[model samples]
Target: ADEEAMLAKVQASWAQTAARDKARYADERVPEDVHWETEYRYEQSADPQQTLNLYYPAKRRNATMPTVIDIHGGGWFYGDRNLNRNYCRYLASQGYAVMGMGYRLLPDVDLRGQIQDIFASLRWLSHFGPQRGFDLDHVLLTGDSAGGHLASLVACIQQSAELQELFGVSRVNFNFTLVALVCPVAEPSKLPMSDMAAFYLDKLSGGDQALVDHLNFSQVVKGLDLPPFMLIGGQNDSFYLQSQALLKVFDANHVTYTTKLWPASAGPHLKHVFNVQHWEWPESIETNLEMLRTFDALSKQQDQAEENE
Candidate 1:
């Protein structure tokens, strides 16, 4: 199917499934010994979405723990940090500090503004982490759907001085050790522009050809120093093709990445963002384990390299 038809089908499927699980989407069960601080304001903007939820293991042997910043996706219009509370809690249970970020959405703020909001949060963590007991030295970025797009953009801009200037952000001091994009919308330009996409794109690009050119992440990767990536997608995910397109960009750039594809043969097919919303599912658990393993191995490598230095 073409991009337009695929997006329509995916949106429809998500709507149906979301309505079915509307009441249960907020998984409130926190793992034991995982402490949380809700609504930590990252930005001075009075908007509530400028805040984030932080989860950390209560007991720690080190002065600080590695951090994971989780961005939520809602087509860039809806969704907040709370959508993946359970997932963050689970990550915290694994002995990492997790930040579930909230950002201003489209229409209210343009794409650049949204990106700035998230970037600002990262800046905040880098500067304030030591005081708050979060180890920004080693960081992981993860997001789903629209969030995947944001996370990808942040990762690219983190390494590009030009993109940083475009967004009017200062130099980035800390870098992500790894980025995990779960069913992310990798190539927004390739998909047919829906009314929602049109509105946000117009705001984001301001009809400037130069600005629009930078939004194509597949193209952006060519000159970026993106960290190792773990790209996960469900068998029935609508953005599976888009994810593959992103992999091609990584291939062209010789970027290192690992992919986990939920097999179509896995009984009933799983949908987009299944790993976060349906953590109880076997596939979700398996993917989560793989991500954790990747993070652990990367962290060890970084430690060993530091020791050698």
Candidate 2:
């Protein structure tokens, strides 16, 4: 009952708020070295309004670059692509091309639909990488909270035939070189399943059993093949339960993962998203830069190993 109540309240609160802030940069659009595209005229998944924002960085001499596709978190009930514009801009500044994405949210669609949207976005990126300035061979999947869950699901779902069929997408040779998940909802089954998630379920299922089954991640993740993972969370975050469940899953699957729990934070759920600007230690941007560096080094090592053969 408490869970249901919490969900109801959060959903009500989210429904009333406008998720998109004004675009952080006006004429500051991505540099000439970076090409910009939105929606890319990709076929929408039944819903034409569903689309993506893509930004690609220029090529550097003798270097393969990384691109980051970011998913914003708002409990799957609220939030939009604009919330992540600053992040994407920062990534672009750091020499990583970035795409901040949007998907159908609650009362309009369910989680399965959201995943469909995510997969479609990835398919578009993989297919258009070279034309758009990204090195098709290198890409990172990143998101926060619910967005993180979707990112992880997308990484794992690449192995699913059913999903591929649902999206009518050809198999693409892409691996998530780095998984940057911030206080993600690691365990959906263990989650409250309150209003935020439930509202979307209602839209997706429209009260249909098969539809509900397709939207549930817990039933599908065991089949997933994971890439290296990095998790950032606040110990006091309300959704830490989801993060804890994720750790267990990572252990069970023998997936390589790194988790940073912010010490002495006030409110719990996804504190880093809110307070990263305030911390002096890692200096938010620098910390993320370091993570990207680690990812770059690991990717190079893997590349070398493959080339040796």
Candidate 3:
């Protein structure tokens, strides 16, 4: 199908599902036990969107807890940190400090600037989290859709010297325990870029076609020492092809990664970022559980390493 037709069909399907499941999309209040602080500025970009909202569990198992940073998706032009309030709170309730970060959108800021904001948020979190009671050493990075793309880019840049030089950015000081991507546009150049994506890409690359081509994550993944990744995608998600392309690269590079696909047999096919949207659903719960399980496994690995030391 042509991109337009495919997009229209997916949008129509999404609208119908949302209308039919109105109750599922209704506002869900944050749990009383989840303590949250909003509008904490992570960057001095002079834009409110540069701030992040943090959620902390009511009780901690130790002096600090592993942190999960969430990046919101709005096709590069439309969302803020507050977009995932309930999900962040839910993560907190699971005993993780959750940081939902906001980046300046297109027109106001280009893709590079957006990436800068995200990296800066990490830098700030690592620098101040200990004093603030967060275990930055054990972190989970997650995002949906466009945010997934950014999150993946950040993850790649962390250990890929080529990517760091391409973007002219320093590697993030802290490594993540796991990176979870939900319906990410993993290969932007291979797929059709939305108007917003193209606009920002043009600005970020100074309309340099070669530079933009290098930004394709399929290319970025080469020679990267990516940490363990958890890829979640719906069988019917429009971005599933992109996710598949990412998997191919990971396989070729022998990267450590795991994937969860919402089975097509499941009734009411899951859409993009379905877990985030349907936080109360059984599938969402199972997905979150899988994430926690990965966290536990990584924590144990870290403990074993320390003991060996």
Candidate 4:
């Protein structure tokens, strides 16, 4: 009788566990090699400032590592940089420098100013990363949702020397080696979310709705030689079709990209939880890691070939 009672108690307690919290199993499962650090400063904005958090492998040798700059997704308004710490820590475990940046929220700063801030953050990383152990030339810019939209813009904008000069910094020739987007808002104008339109149009164009359609990535990344991209999306995502639209752009431009689509029958919402926790997509993770490896390998090969020549 006591054994049955104990079994029932265990079952009841397990049933009560919150599903949302359960979804974030990676927080509890992250390896010990990674550590987190936070800093606050105005990247480009005036006082009241923004922040950036660094996740790095703690035990380091003299090797200079590649950097991953993560721009968090919040539809330009609500999310905080700290929300993705677990993922950053995970990436750091895989041996890369991870920096998550905070930008000025919309209605306070317009879309262009916020983009300027992101590039400014990249410039900041490029200038200072070497001192901290990362090779800035190998920096990969990444983001999720709205941040994904911004990442694409950052890549496109970096193509022009004039635009790269907006930060009053020397041109980086940003090597942007790899990109990863998770359920991103690919096309801003066609976004079904009304709150996004209000925040974007009001601040970006002084309430001009036409400007929203004009600010799409399809128009921006047209002729640039972009880094290879890894796109993770779901049929459950409101932007799934738009996700495919981005792939189409990549295909038409001959931009190298790999995509993993989760069916609605398999899951719902952003499947980042699935990727990090269970081993459901280990091969995808391996492929993504290999992309980074190949980037480093090719770079070394180019240097060797140059020296030989």
Candidate 5:
């Protein structure tokens, strides 16, 4: 009942938004040095959309490397893991084991199913990733837009027993040491086309409205302890306002995080989820490097803390 009500609602037109954005990026060159093996299927049907790719550094390592799991954002209706392939490769080249994950899109599978796919991937990784020389001891989670929302949701959900039941997902062996949200739509109500998310209510709720209230970041995260987060966004994003609003929620909840919200004056290329697209652009490269640097340092701190203890 504490949910914020919208005064004016815009129509949700995700296909047009996705298509126009897809046209903006003609560059899909990935780091050739990085080697990846595709076709890690988590589901029994071997669904291509539900498969994941494991990317290792240009040169294979003799020891296990830290891992990063990246979820792709497609407005919940489009996109696959390959959407962020170039960016993931760049991360691999930087010497981390990165997995580009895909989940079933909406309509084919509701929000609940998408989340289940996330847990499924982690279970698969727990059993198989280490065999390939990837360590999960201190993993980092990253996603942009809708996938950003899901990563935060999945991370938060996995830490709570009640939330796991509410979201209808089983336990996974993975835990994140750090998280990155690039222009995330954490709260659907904060979006311009807030009403367009009515389908989420119908599909994810299963005839129960109160069940899916986590659609608002506040509801799901009300009393949960969240992992450290790196929240990045640009003012040009429609959900940029959502970024500001989410920062307040994180603050009020006493969540630890770092943020860099480039103003509209920053640069045109620094639009929503730009880092996931223009990996070659200076602005995009800078934003991505910041997260990578932070992740590396924080992960080291975590290791040192454990060693000292």
Candidate 6:
């Protein structure tokens, strides 16, 4: 009960923080240009956490458009599909089909289960996408905070057979055109043990000793053919340097990426995953728009448009 008690304590704090901030997004007036559909099941079971919320441009921009999958985070133990619904809507307004995903959280399930949940959502999307006007040719992946860590795992797993087997996740159909790790907990093992790394790895390992190393993206991504990455960081977040450390590794791997570290001149209160929590903030808006442009620059639409010019 002692071990469980600490986890329970962690969960309570996360849930409370999530709840307090969730109210900020409660009064959403859906943008006119984006069409949104509330939770759609990714599985036969009606479990709400296995569902995804959808957003698409109300008017057609192409026969189909690139899609984005955003994994909402709460230390891998909290949050839901609707947590970032407004962010999803904003992407749709920019002419991409955005799926804000949900997964069963910790305590109910372990880290392994969460990874599989992501695989399943992509499996469902691959099977259902084309008919829904979603282009699989170019897909963008984004997550913030703990989400960044998970997204990094999934991104690496997509390219490495070794990681897929190690993580016990199956290959999903889509390939990422770009990945955005916003204020992510990418190098969890390197983090101060008392702060969060130990707590995160405790649950991540979840009785399996083998996972501790694999769960650390910094070590796992080596030798994988990673897609272009966009590393977003904030001046005030404790994890800012980890984002920088990851940038160096990306360089070592010859991975193409963009780095945006909020300087003091960029203004204040810019903390970890600042964009996700403060999606309406001007700084967040600026970061998100650049992310969209990065996705577009690597896309077929932009390619064809430029070639035709």
Task: Give each model's whole-structure lDDT.
Answer: 0.80, 0.65, 0.77, 0.66, 0.79, 0.81
Q: lDDT of model 5 at residue 215? A: 69
> Model 2, residue 167: displacement in angstroms?
7.4
Candidate 3 vs candidate 5, lDDT winner: 5
* Shift in Å, residue 238, candidate 6: 3.7
Candidates, ranked, TM-score? 6, 5, 1, 3, 2, 4
TM-score of 6: 0.91
Sort the candidates on lDDT, descending order.
6, 1, 5, 3, 4, 2
Q: Which stretches of candidate 1 lie over 4 Å from their true place?
A: 1-21, 26-30, 193-200
**Candidate 2 residues 190-297, lDDT tens each?**
554365555444654557675555544455566567678887776766677777777777777777888766665533333546422222223454556666786787
Kindly give the number of clashing pairs for every candidate.
0, 5, 0, 0, 0, 0
Residue 254: error of model 3 in Å? 1.3
Model 3 whole-model lDDT (C-alpha atoms): 0.77
| Higher-ranked by lDDT: 2 or 3 | 3
Provide TM-scores for the models.
Answer: 0.88, 0.78, 0.86, 0.76, 0.89, 0.91
> What does the lDDT read for residue 14 in candidate 6?
89
| Decoy 1 TM-score against native | 0.88
Residues 1-309, candidate 3: write the lDDT tens digits: 354564465456546654544555365544557888888898665789889888988887778888899998866656678777777888888888888888887545667778778888888887777787788778899988888888888888888777677666777677888999989986777665376344445654556555576666676677767789899987788888888888887788888988888877775648778788767677887988798788778877986887842
Model 4 pairs whose backbones collide: none
lDDT of 4 by residue, 67-100 (tens): 7888877666544556566667767777888888
* Poorest lDDT segment (10 consecutive residues) of candidate 4: 272-281
- Candidate 2 clashing pairs? 7-195, 236-268, 237-268, 237-269, 238-269
Off by over 4 Å in 5: 1-26, 192-197, 200-206
